[PDB]
Amino acid sequence: VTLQDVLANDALVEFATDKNGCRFLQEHYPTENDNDVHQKLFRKLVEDRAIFLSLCSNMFGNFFVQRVLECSNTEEQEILTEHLATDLYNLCLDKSACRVIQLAIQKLDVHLATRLSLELRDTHLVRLSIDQNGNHVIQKIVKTLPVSSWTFLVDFFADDDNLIHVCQDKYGCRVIQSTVETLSTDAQCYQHRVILLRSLMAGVTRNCTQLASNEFANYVVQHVIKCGDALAVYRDIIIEQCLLQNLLSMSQEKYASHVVEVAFECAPYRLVAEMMNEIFEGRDALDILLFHQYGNYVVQQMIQTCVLGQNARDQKQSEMYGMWLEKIHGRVMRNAHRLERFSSGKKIIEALQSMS
RNA sequence: UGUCAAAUG
Fold first, then answer.
1. What is Dmax (Cα atoms) for chain A?
2. Nearest nucleotide relative to A261: CA against C1'
3. CA-to-CA distance for A264 and A342, rounded, in angstroms?
4. A197, A179 in Cβ contact below 8 A?
5. Domains and CATH numbers, chain A
6. For strand B, is any atom closer than 7 Å to the CB of A152?
7. Is the CB of A139 under 7 A from strand B?
8. How far apart, in whole angstroms, are the C-alpha atoms of residue A103 and residue A89?
9. I want to staple A72 with a disulfide (CB 3.0 to 4.6 A). Which of A49, A67, A76, A263 is the partner?
């Protein structure tokens, strides 16, 4: 069995759609673009546009299309880009063909991959971003191509309704986070990515209460708070304008209590002190959270924040961390008999008894 | 005691 038999029998489809036949095609396809067998196999692949797209959508044929993409030059890439463009939206939703698309974003010349990226603008961008296959195509574009090739995505997610529908989705929350990560990492003299990030993050902070409460978008809100210097201004905006004056309610929520936790873990001192003051100065708020099924984890993070903050340098901050830790220690010791009956109050006591 | 956390042979 040779490749010359495959060409003479006109049996590219039969080999490519078979598991062992495609592996034979992958291993023996000549890599050089001026090889005669290479050109004859490439012609058989792209002569019939419908045959090519069916091979892209085939469980085994897509691996051969990917191999052709790896060895492709600019002339071959021009033909492949034209074929993929005619059915690009459905190829991004297909289980096999989205892997052809994802490799094409990496492998094609940037102006060819930019053509495929920009073609998605007039399609259904929410349906792409939430598809089990399509969300990987969007993230591949964002992580690989220059921002000029996908700036329409930033404009699209600047609408609050688009952002909420995508960010609350199981897969779309990854799409929002990958866009945020790419725009927030660098530096740039004129800060074009900074301005683009500000447009995207404005929707995040406007709808942060709904997003922190959501089963999937709470991960995105946590990422902004936990990120560090890249998203530090947006972390502080989220804490000041959403979390403050709502800490008692959010610490009692199934998903938003995780947001309150990472805020206590990562806020600057000036915001930690406002958060501590809200809990302590309004059965008070600390008593509610100590016995709460979600709020007890917030108290445990409040304890760990004060334990680490005692070893700070400011020494006026370090006094306040000890003052807050002792105030938690006083309230736990008063209610220790009731707290010991459950694992939540036991873990709080075990954290306090490691020191005293 | 707390989270549905990403698609091919």
1. 88
2. B2
3. 24
4. no
5. 232-356 (1.25.10.10)
6. no
7. yes
8. 16
9. A76
Tokens 């059965």 belong to residue: A283
Count Cα neighbours of A157 within 13 Å in the Cβ-side half-sphere.
27
C1’ B7 / CA A144, Å: 18
Contact between A267 and A235 under an 8 Å Cβ cutoff? The reply is yes
The experimental resolution of this structure, in angstroms, equals 2.3
Q: Which amino acid is at A323?
A: M
Which experimental method was this entry solved with? Answer: X-ray
Q: Are A157 and A179 in contact (CB under 8 A)?
A: yes
In sequence order, what DSSP letters do the residues of A185-215 get, joined into one string?
A: ----SS-HHHHHHHHHHHHHHHTHHHHHHST
Helix axes A110-119, A134-144, angle to 10 degrees: 140
Alpha-carbon span A195 to A188, nearest angstrom: 11
Q: Identify the residue whose Cα has the smallest distance to the C1' of B8.
A: A96
- Rounded Cα distance between A353 and A65, Å, is 62
CA-closest candidate to residue A130, choices A99, A157, A93, A182: A93
A44 Cβ contacts chain B strand, under 7 Å: no
| A59, closest nucleotide (Cα–C1') | B8
Terminal Cα distance for chain A, rounded: 77
- Please state, in angstroms and rounded to a whole number, the distance separating the CA atoms of residues A245 and A30: 66
In this structure, is the CB of residue A157 within 7 Å of any atom belonging to strand B? no
Nucleotide nearest to A134 (CA to C1'): B7
User: Any alpha helices (H) in A120-252, and if so which ranges?
Assistant: 125-130, 134-144, 151-157, 160-167, 172-184, 192-206, 208-213, 217-226, 232-238, 247-250
For residue A296, give both structure tokens: 């007890």
- Closest nucleotide to A342 by C1' from CA: B1
Alpha-carbon gap, residue A95 to A59, rounded angstroms: 8
